[PDB]
């Protein structure tokens, strides 16, 4: 079974949880503040539950309900497979849901100004640096990283 959380948000002196999972036996919920909880393990599948909040039988309105053929309104819970693995659950949750910036000074710092150059700050990698067009030929440059090594490629291209 997978740990499921039952939390009654609201005040109370005595708060119990009756459910399909425990043959509707009144299970006391422990209170922190205005939250009374229970963490019980339930099998993957449909489960019905109700609350016994201070002598009155209720359901969490914010939670999915089901009305019986006899007019019994209990809360429902489909405990899904994707709810147990964190990265599957956060993936299913992801699916359910001016003025120009001031130029960072990190970018004005270069590694170019023999073949061996200083290690660059990660922030300037993949940026285009060019030299002034002297004699109808532009010089382009950029430092990229391959694995743990870095290469500053210079392209001499006429324009």
């Amino acid at each position: 079974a997978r740990p499921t959380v039952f939390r009654w948000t609201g005040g109370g002196k005595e708060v119990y949880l009756s459910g399909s999972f425990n043959n509707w036996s009144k299970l006391p919920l422990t209170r922190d503040q205005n939250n009374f909880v229970a963490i019980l393990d339930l099998p993957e599948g449909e489960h019905q539950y109700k609350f016994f909040v201070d002598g009155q039988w209720t359901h969490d309105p914010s939670e999915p309900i089901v009305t019986s053929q006899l007019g019994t309104v209990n809360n429902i819970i489909q405990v899904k497979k994707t709810d147990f693995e964190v990265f599957d659950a956060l993936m299913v949750d992801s699916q359910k849901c001016k003025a120009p910036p001031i130029l960072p000074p990190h970018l004005l710092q270069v590694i170019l100004n023999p073949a061996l150059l200083p290690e660059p700050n990660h922030v300037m990698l993949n940026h285009l640096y060019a030299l002034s067009i002297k004699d109808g030929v532009m010089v382009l440059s950029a430092t990229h990283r391959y694995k743990k090594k870095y290469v500053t490629t210079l392209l001499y291209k006429p324009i």
């Binding site: 150059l117 030929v137 391959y146 090594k149 210079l154 392209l155 001499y156 291209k157």
Partner: protein, 289 residues
């Protein structure tokens, strides 16, 4: 071979430095501008990008300069038009009328050494297949430097103890040499017809005085003096001590010598300091693969 197993295991990536500089020329760039950019950037080789073909078509090296400079030199009173006004593509179309070699960083240093000799090249571009980007240009000097770091820490075999004469490694016959009097144009002539890195400079007698390398040819482009090739080999070398080995010097000792002074080839000189042979970095890596 124990050194060959070391190479067949180590990735090309490991030899790539922490932070490299790479100069790429578009094939449309005027060929003179290309050789000057090599000089200014302090790089001896440049991958070439054919924008129309959207791929690296080849490499531009000092040999390209040596070739234009000799194919097209008319005299010192008249400009090398072709060198002046010609694109890298226009000259490559001529020179290569009658393909690109590269190693992946995932390939082993042995594959790289094999590929170097197999095609008879000194500059090998390391290209990541996923990106298609050229990362670094693997040289003999660099491979030999890395193999020397391990040769020292690891034991010394039988070959290392043996002499250069006994082990018989390198070229000792048909040694192409220039003389003091010999002009640069003639030296460039030799470099073309023979396809060898350096030419030992010899005096009145067959003794080696200096060594004119394919590198010293880069200086003509640096000083913008390539228009006067009539100058002697010695006059040309005045812009900048000679290193020679003996036939009875150990292979491991000469291996340390080539790496210690970081030279491309050692000259095999006899007791009366006359040229008897030659041994290059290329041969050393071959003998070890």
């Amino acid at each position: 071979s124990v050194y060959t197993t070391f190479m067949k295991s180590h990735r090309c990536y490991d030899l790539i430095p922490t932070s490299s500089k790479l100069v790429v020329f578009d094939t449309s760039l005027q060929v003179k501008k290309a050789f000057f950019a090599l000089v200014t950037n302090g790089v001896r080789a440049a991958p070439l990008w054919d924008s129309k073909k959207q791929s690296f078509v080849g490499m531009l090296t000092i040999t390209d300069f040596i070739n234009i400079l000799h194919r097209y030199y008319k005299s010192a009173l008249v400009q090398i038009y072709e060198l002046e006004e010609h694109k890298i593509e226009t000259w490559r179309e001529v020179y290569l009328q009658d393909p690109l070699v590269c190693i992946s960083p995932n390939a082993s240093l042995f594959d790289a050494v094999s590929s170097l000799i197999r095609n008879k090249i000194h500059r090998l571009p390391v290209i990541d297949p996923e990106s298609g980007n050229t990362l670094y240009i693997l040289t003999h000097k660099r491979i030999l430097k890395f193999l020397k770091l391990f040769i020292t820490e690891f034991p010394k075999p039988e070959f290392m103890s043996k002499s250069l004469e006994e082990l018989q490694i390198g070229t000792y016959a048909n040694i192409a040499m220039v003389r003091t009097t010999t002009p640069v144009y003639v030296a460039l002539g030799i470099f073309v017809q023979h396809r060898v890195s350096a030419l030992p400079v010899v005096d009145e007698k067959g003794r080696v005085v200096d060594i004119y390398s394919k590198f010293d040819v880069i200086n003509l482009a640096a000083e913008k003096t390539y228009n006067n090739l009539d100058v002697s080999v010695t006059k040309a070398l005045q812009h900048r001590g000679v290193l020679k080995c003996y036939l009875h010097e150990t292979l491991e000792a000469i291996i340390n010598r080539l790496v210690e002074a970081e030279v491309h080839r050692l000259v095999v000189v006899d007791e009366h300091d006359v040229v008897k042979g030659i041994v290059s970095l290329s041969d050393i890596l071959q003998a070890l693969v």
